[model samples]
Target chain A: ERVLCLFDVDGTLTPARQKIDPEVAAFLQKLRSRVQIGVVGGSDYCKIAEQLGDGDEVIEKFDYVFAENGTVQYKHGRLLSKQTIQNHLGEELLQDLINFCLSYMALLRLPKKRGTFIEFRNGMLNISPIGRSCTLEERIEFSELDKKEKIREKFVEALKTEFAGKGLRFSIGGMISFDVFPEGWDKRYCLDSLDQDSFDTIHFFGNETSPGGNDFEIFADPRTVGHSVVSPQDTVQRCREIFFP
Target chain B: ERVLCLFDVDGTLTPARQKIDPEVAAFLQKLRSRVQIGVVGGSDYCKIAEQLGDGDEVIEKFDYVFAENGTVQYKHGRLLSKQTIQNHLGEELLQDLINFCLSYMALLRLPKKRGTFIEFRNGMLNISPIGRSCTLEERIEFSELDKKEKIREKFVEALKTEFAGKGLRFSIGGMISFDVFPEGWDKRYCLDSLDQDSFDTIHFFGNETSPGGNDFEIFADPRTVGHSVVSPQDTVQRCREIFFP
Candidate 1:
């Protein structure tokens, strides 16, 4: 059977930012013999590679490596394709979003504002009122303040009103920043590319699979047989039960 | 003599974004024996290092390397110190400036607007209307538009009015962007460190010493004896006439 199994990097493959266990890495290769295997992560290629392997070594290990939710893709240890948010969203809409965020943050009177308040990313724009360059203590402080003031919540609401019907989406994740991206930029973004390969069956595994999680869309996507994994051990055990069994 | 011969990178030290001539590199080292030699460029350390030598080799080649207008300093084959525009401007003022740029770029309608309208640099905010990620063809088109429409000039004036009396400075140069920084953040920013070191003499050299040029402030500074050179050959000849002869 020409089936594909895809796992998330953070909790499904390794402990968040830590490297994958040698045993797990070996098992994935073993499983690869039975089914085409790959990994998809919200992080950029280097960070995902840091956890999966070293340097660009992850590409060689996985049949498909979808970094930045597959805006950047590598297939069969070779470069596949890349996409940028500006290219997808067009110029006017992007500038409107940027300008809105800029004006909103300008009026934000936090304890301290630092550089990189608006970080232009390959997949999204990470906007922070407190600024991302703030120290760890500052991040925590902003988080606490946000919990009380609903700073990010209000900001997200502002964005929603401003870009209503604009095909834009916002996620208030992490302590200091909120992410803005096109509607389909979540884990489901990679599913389209995988569909093109014509696999008879597709399996998706991730720790964060519930509603509001990064993996929610892909987990619920009809294209994949979604599995919620608690840890790397859970993922390996689940894969064995499904594919090997 | 306790002297420092400081040169601008792009034009004074080497052809713009290209490597130094081997003969020029040899001459600088030869001249270094007589006087402390350094390079001060508006570019970041890596880019300056790229033009001067490979990797971080530029630090070893020069007695001092003041990249990003001396906000990143390396002296005596070791890193001295660093400063950020955010730190210098403080949180409120920095956010105010960022927000203003964001709003301004939003209202700007053009042939195209690319990402990174406001680039956060160690020393300045490089604001571009067409966006810095535009192609060479786009940059040429925008530059042509800018000249005719006075786009950047109008933006600069807006910034001056918005941040009036905020000790902010704006300089429009290059093909697609203008730079914004503190009043004290020109090449003269490094002179204070040199002053502390108690150099008996300081010589500044550059091609662009005209009033609005980057090298103008440092070249005209009372603390430094400035020389205007047409090219690498002229710089060598000028250095010979002053230091060697």
Candidate 2:
């Protein structure tokens, strides 16, 4: 029987925005002998590939790599399927949401605004009020201010009300940005493209299963047993339990 | 390794709105010795129990019973958890949608309206423009007319546009009605509650994995190997392959 093991890319497999841990990568290479492995993330596939480092090894170790909250599915580094949010919500609505965020910048008093406040990935809409183009130092500065003002939280609340009844959902995507997608279309969407019968059981390791986190849906899903991790070390310990237990 | 087998209640284990098939039940009884099994349905636990017939046998044969589209999970007939949609959409919005549907009756030319147009079950908002109060004969009459006039189709379309950005989703249920819920909280939600590591592979058998069907979410979910069945006999055939293969 095959076991399907799914790992969240950021935080779980790697420290936020960093490359995968060498130790974790080595452990995963060993674990692949006993199970079908996959990785999923909110970022684009290019970022996922970059984070995993040795691209060829990542393809071999992970039977599938799901990017953009499962909106993009890849097998052996080849694209299997790509589901876009653009079809679900037309460009008109997309532009309206971008415009709404632009208007909110002044009202929220968010200083140090950067370009690319709203980004459209293949599978989702990424909105960073501070802007994705912010440098590392700028991102750190905004992070501190965001913690104090809860800008993203307030923005999410306002968007929920403004778009109330439209099947759009919003969740914080790492530290600096948030992801928006159609309902039921989160990281768990990756499971939709999986051949589930091949694996006897499925296990998921994620860093952000907490409420409002991008990984919450996957962790909250009842089908896959979910383990919440703090860092790559925590994930390594969990993998030990799965293999040794 | 253990195998997890998930079966859909309607059309797979039983005919739509019918009881469990005796032959299939016997097959399940025999197959239980080899793998873990579970049943998930859109209805409530009581309804699930009634459809499965011998409640005690159901509890014994299946390791878990997920009802209300996986919002209510039961293991050995004991409640594991109940997740509410309240946080996803507030009461005010629900009431507004109900009121909007009520007002649409005149414009849609829906005659002989029955009470209980909107029924909130454990996990879903079941909307029957024709009303759930209709008798079986009335149900048949409406079913035929629904096909000819595409009343439910038109109703779903309008609801989609009206509630465009709200993260609410709409899909057709069994014969006479459609269901609405927060996106990602569909039948596949039951998968969230399962201890996936206990099984080697997960298999799902359903009737409505087709577009717009209630089982579509679970069937479309790549986490479970989905088998689309027309009747209990088809399910029996599929189960034989799993057991005998």
Candidate 3:
């Protein structure tokens, strides 16, 4: 049976940003003997590997590891391919966008500002008005301010207008920052590569399977038989009923 | 003799931003018993400790450790006092200055820009145009452009004009950045604390003792005997002649 059970590393496999539970890790491995297993995560390879297993053992454990929304890929414990956000967007547009954010933040006043205002990632650029290096107290403070002022909502709209028809998408999330990335740079980005495997069926598991969530597009895509779960225990239960049965 | 020998850590005791050589660390401890040996450097306590000795052991290694130009003080292996840039400059003025730097950097274009543009320290604020997180090659590239276009020079001038007569000073040093601090926030800032110790004399050793250099004010002060040396070996040799003689 050529079948692939793809799991979202964060939340679906483990508590977000935490190491996988031994029971869950063991269950996934045991299930792998029956069906091919893979993991896709939003974080880069290093961070994903850190939370999943000890060092690079995660790569060996999983059949397919799609990190940074498949911008970085690993298969058979080796690097299969890579992509850069700057490369896809082009240096010209990236610089122009970076410059715009700088100017906007400059003019906007806040209660306080810390360093690391802009944190660039492989798949996205995270922009924080109060800066990403602020304390927890400061982070909460800015979050309240943002909700009242509609700071992030307005900022995203401005970018939308300025970079109209540029194939860019903005996701305002968390307490302190919003992520800017290209359209189609989500979990579904990995589907093209997975299609070549010619699996009988592909099962997708994620916590955020509702619309507007990061996993929604991939979870709802016609190609994937998606299952939404609340926790790692739920994912295992769902997998047992479907695959182990 | 109630003598105090205050040495600059970066160049005089060890090479800049590097761990002390075994001999240099051993020799400094040996010299400490004879005279009240101390170290005064521009770096913070954590960084100074890392370079001087093992962890907090550096605090006990030296009788007087003046870090961040003595804005943070440690006496007899315990915390004596501390100060901060934001407290001294006031939030209003500091935020204004930060906003200015951000706006300016936004307008000016560079070959490449990285993160960590503003680094807040205990005694000062560091501003980098091309960012401090850039690679060695990128740093050199910005350095060359800075020289040819006088980028930092003009930026400093602009800051001086904007904050005229505000007791603020701008130091354009290193390859990619400039430091901003309050007046008298230099090596000499520690001398006031040492004067209270009431020693027979304060002996100063430093490499950059020329006028306009960070060490110049304290080194040339009439209250102390200044010995300029080129390297750690020279510093050791100078100490042998003056103290061991």
Candidate 4:
């Protein structure tokens, strides 16, 4: 039976957002001989490139690279498939959302406004009320204040109430904002691009599988064995368990 | 062998983000007799409750409910586990990120600044530069101008450069913002809470597996079989294929 091992980039292969560890890379290279290896993350191709580093050998270590959640797929430097959020959710609703976010900002009475609050990616929507332009110190300050105020919780709650039936899905994505998308369009969409029957067993590693995180869907799925890790070192340990056990 | 079937909430079990389809729910209820069923998504418990409804019967239909990407888990209305982003990344680092964001904002020269640009969620970070306070018209206007100027792309590129090797991960998340987190902390974090060896085969369904999406990790994993659906109707059809085939 063919074994497919999938890895989440951040925290799994790298420490937080650091580059892939040489030890981990070597381990992965060793595993490649036994099973098909792939990487999937919420980052774009460029970020993924930075994590894996340059060169065909490093890139070719994995059988596939899934970036932008799962909208873009690459097989050993070859683009296999790609999807855009615009195509999934029509422009009209997207416009409505932009409007909704603007109104919500006023309702929330947030402090320290910055620029570029809403960001549109190829397959996801990032909504932030606190402005993306804050300094690290500012981010920490807002984060502390937000903890006291529960501002994000309120904002997400309000968004759910306002757009309850809009067919859009919302989730607390990162440290400072939430994600909005057409229903069913989270990271799981990448499954459509895979040939499931090819593998007898599948294993996945990730870090953000908590509620309101990006990894929750796949972690909650029963089809693939899900392993959660706190750091790249933890991931290495888990991989050792899987390969050795 | 125990067959585990997991369903994505938004587009898979309902139309976009609407309520569960009666037929789909009923089908799931029926499938419950033969398989271990679960529901996972990017929404929080409140939103998931809205999607599945507040009734216990409806909630009890699934063996597991994974919400907030999978950080929060429920079985028979009992909370199993939960993880928070704040706990993962220390407050000091988070504060630094806030400071970094503030400095980056000045560098970008964003227009129409509003408040609440960065938000901290339990599991993710949300960053927007457009001051989440723009009116719909303003947002539209900015979006158009941004398209021409490629402002967001430039901003993200700059962020990557400045924060490179900083152990942080950035991704375009929603319509107007992006997500930032420690490496490996995306949606895959939920896997740590699951018991993978119990099930022989795992099946997953999702909508947002596109590039740059949250669900891409599991979908790209070769272990479990992945099914993609455009709507609840599509999911229903796929379920029938699985159960009746």
Candidate 5:
């Protein structure tokens, strides 16, 4: 049985907002010579393929790619399978929440310089003070706006109050976004769905695995291990450690 | 002429204590199709080169690798040049500091961890915690150790009193560590040393770029340009956005 080396791509491999380093590529080549490799990603499969574009030297090296928040899988750029859980809660309740936010945004006393955005992403609601076009600093400051904070707090409270015992989970991501999902459909599912008998060891790498963060759920499991937390500024060195070590 | 994509390896690409992702290799292939890529790392050239073993596939896709915290530069994995700055303060000062810390560690009844290291990197004294074996939790706890905190505070106060107008700047990083350097030899120096005219567009991704963190220096720059802060959880997604979007 071969050990599985599962890696997260963004913060783990390339740091945020920067390009990959050459030393990292060399290390991957060395690892490929030694063991089997797999990738678990939060983005869709097509996105993964595009990001990891055309390094046949590297492409021919991996065995699998788990994509779409572990909802899909691919091997050698070919679709292997997928397991999308059916949303039992239905879209009507979600629509109501979006509509409520829209109406609430108009009534709330928001800061004059900012606007609001109700983004529907992968069955999650992202309410931001500024639209997605804002810069990083702008987005962070906008998230702190009085109206946005107030509405977010109230919305979360209501979500808890309404779905308290209904097996629902909520997560806050980015600067001004929240993700609500069925409790069982997180990184844990990736492990459960994997062919465990085929691999002896599994290692994970992610950035947002901190306290109350999205990837934190994955880290809580003893079976699912983390490599380290990589940031944008530290991308190059982190990559060196990962590929070479 | 093709532009250079200068990057830092560790903490930048791979998460802390993790290995490089294959997706990173693939992403570099796509990025190299557009422009020249390079790396700027803190480790020695041999170490960095060993970490990044292959040159042609994903590693050789880059044009340069600036190692030893930008004290050395290699082009296409070949040595282009190397330069080192003199320590005017002499190694005696660093040895004295280490001796003092060793004495203090014993007197204060703290754990006998690894001795402190005075990394003469990039023309400065970088005091790092024990070694790679230390975890983030241990580091956080060390930061708040009453004995160390009090000693640091008094030491800084005394230094200020003795040399009120001197040019040395002192700060802390990681855990149970301190840095003394000329005020200008920070991350900005790494950025400024780059051929910015080639790749005018730059983005930085970091986990702990906030105040008092290690990567805080790069994040604090006003002129550095980029989009998004990537956490480890968003690694796959961040890469996809770069290639797909």
Candidate 6:
């Protein structure tokens, strides 16, 4: 392949509540004719595909996809492999965590959102304080709540320190969620494991890059020097630039 | 002008839980060369298109779409129109109805699913009991509840009599829901209002058409002579047979 461009969806390709930008669509069409292009996302593969609109066709131009917050890797829309180190966490532990959170929320009578997710590909249990149903604006506000931050930070820290002895890793992302995977199973690991030398260069784009954000490690690392930041609203514009440039 | 084929998105073109079948995709491609095609759905226009993947290409083949339950229409990847009918029951009246339903639900202590919506379209309102966050399974179960039917039936009956003198109509369909419109506003009315007559032979399929169901009135009319049933899966498979045969 000539080069690989890894794009994050949501803010990178389309703005919040807006449909796919036409300019972005044209850019992707042009870019795909030359270099390899793929998407790395915090969303499920199907969802990622949905966000890309003509992704089945556009993504066909790429070699692989790192999805579900790096829990899955796919080539040509088919799952090539999955790593679930946190699977050892088991259903019992998951139920315990869920019950603890639910009871905590109930005790506080906190205005909270709930969803049906319990596990991720990498044995990481997720506790989303704002149900998966919140609007983009609602999610931003929910993430800023002091109680929500305190709970999420404490949970991640406790999990990491508790599992450090056992050699596990914990991560948090989105407005109100955290996940646990096996040690060495962050975005960096996923990227490093890729056969990078096959391409001349790689460009990474993302919306989440704060220290505790799932994408923080990938965007902050010096290795991802050409990495770019695009708000969800700027995705289509930036993608157009990449296309025309 | 060629005859146009309009298909619904959810449950009509694809299964609720699985990816779009390759066979279905192939069928659409083959059919597109022979006939004009359109899609109608209750989701946002972009979302409906996005789910098709290669939506731009699909738009080239698929002639038109009436999305967001006919609130908007798009053709050849461009939005042709968005019809926002007001005053039959303005936002305030619609909100009142929704609040009434919610308060009733709260009194019953019925666990409500999210993604349940009360959608206003074409001078009508559809009251959906589940929020937008619910999964298909959750919606089906919520719809199947005996109490839900009883409540809806009673509510509809009371509302019909209550609103009879006011020249409004109410109908219920699929799961726990009801719709209110002017004397004659529905899919058939909207479809009939389309001016294209030379391109007339239309085949329709949906999953919400039990007797007295919202879609039943349109499908069951002898004069309309449309082909319809209560399964989108069956509709898609049958469409293939019609196209390929």
How much does each candidate deviate at the interface, measured as C-alpha RMSD after superposition? 2.9, 20.3, 1.4, 9.9, 26.8, 10.1
Q: Write the number of the candidate with greater DockQ, choosing between 1 and 2.
A: 1
True contacts kept of each: 0.38, 0.00, 0.48, 0.06, 0.00, 0.00
lDDT: which candidate is best?
3
> Candidate 6, DockQ to 2 decimals?
0.03
- The DockQ assigned to candidate 5 is 0.01
Q: Can you write out model 3's per-residue Cα lDDT over B1-245, one digit (the tens) per residue?
A: 89988999878989899999999888887788789899999888999999987779888889898998998889988888677676787878888888998899898888887667777777888899877767798899999999999999999999999999998998998799999999989888898888888899899999999987788989988878999988999999998888778
TM-score of 5: 0.40
**Clashing residue pairs, candidate 3?**
none
Candidate 2 interface RMS: 20.3
Candidate that would win on TM-score: 1
Cα error of candidate 6 at position B4, Å: 1.5
**In model 5, what is the error at residue B91, expressed in angstroms?**
62
Candidate 2: tens digits of C-alpha lDDT, residues B1-245: 56877888987888776778778888887778777778988788778888886655566567888878778877865777565454457755654565555456434444333334556566876777655655687688888889899899888999899999988888775557888888888788877666454555788888888887778888888777888988888888888886878
Residues A1-245, candidate 1, lDDT per residue (tens digit)?
A: 89999998998989887899999999999999899998998888889888888788889989999988888889999987578787899977887787777677767778766556677777888888876667798899999999999999999998999889999988887799888889999888888988889999999999999997889999999999999999999999998998789
Write model 6 residue lDDT over B37-80, tens digit each, in one string: 77766555556656676645556656776665455666666765
DockQ per candidate, 2 decimals? 0.42, 0.01, 0.51, 0.04, 0.01, 0.03
For residues B174-206, write the lDDT of model 4, one tens digit per residue.
Answer: 346777767766555555554553777778887
Every model: Cα RMSD to truth: 2.3, 22.5, 3.5, 26.8, 24.1, 12.1
Q: Which stretches of candidate 6 lie over 4 Å from their true place?
A: A1-245, B10-12, B16-18, B54-58, B85-106, B111-149, B165-183, B197-200, B203-210, B213-225, B229-245
Q: Compute the lDDT of residue B245 as modeled in candidate 5.
A: 75
Candidates in order, TM-scores: namely 0.92, 0.47, 0.86, 0.48, 0.40, 0.42
Candidate 4 runs further than 4 Å off = A54-58, A208-213, B1-245
Between candidates 3 and 5, name the one with more favorable DockQ.
Answer: 3
- The candidate scoring highest on DockQ is 3
Q: Which order, best to worst by lDDT?
A: 3, 1, 2, 4, 6, 5
What lDDT score goes with residue B112 in model 2?
Answer: 36
Summarize candidate 3's per-residue lDDT along A52-86 as a digit string, tens digits: 89979988999999998887788768787567777
What lDDT score goes with residue B91 in model 2?
51
lDDT comparison, 3 vs 6, better candidate:
3
Error of 6 at B230 (Å): 7.2
TM-scores for chain A over all candidates: 0.94, 0.84, 0.92, 0.85, 0.69, 0.67
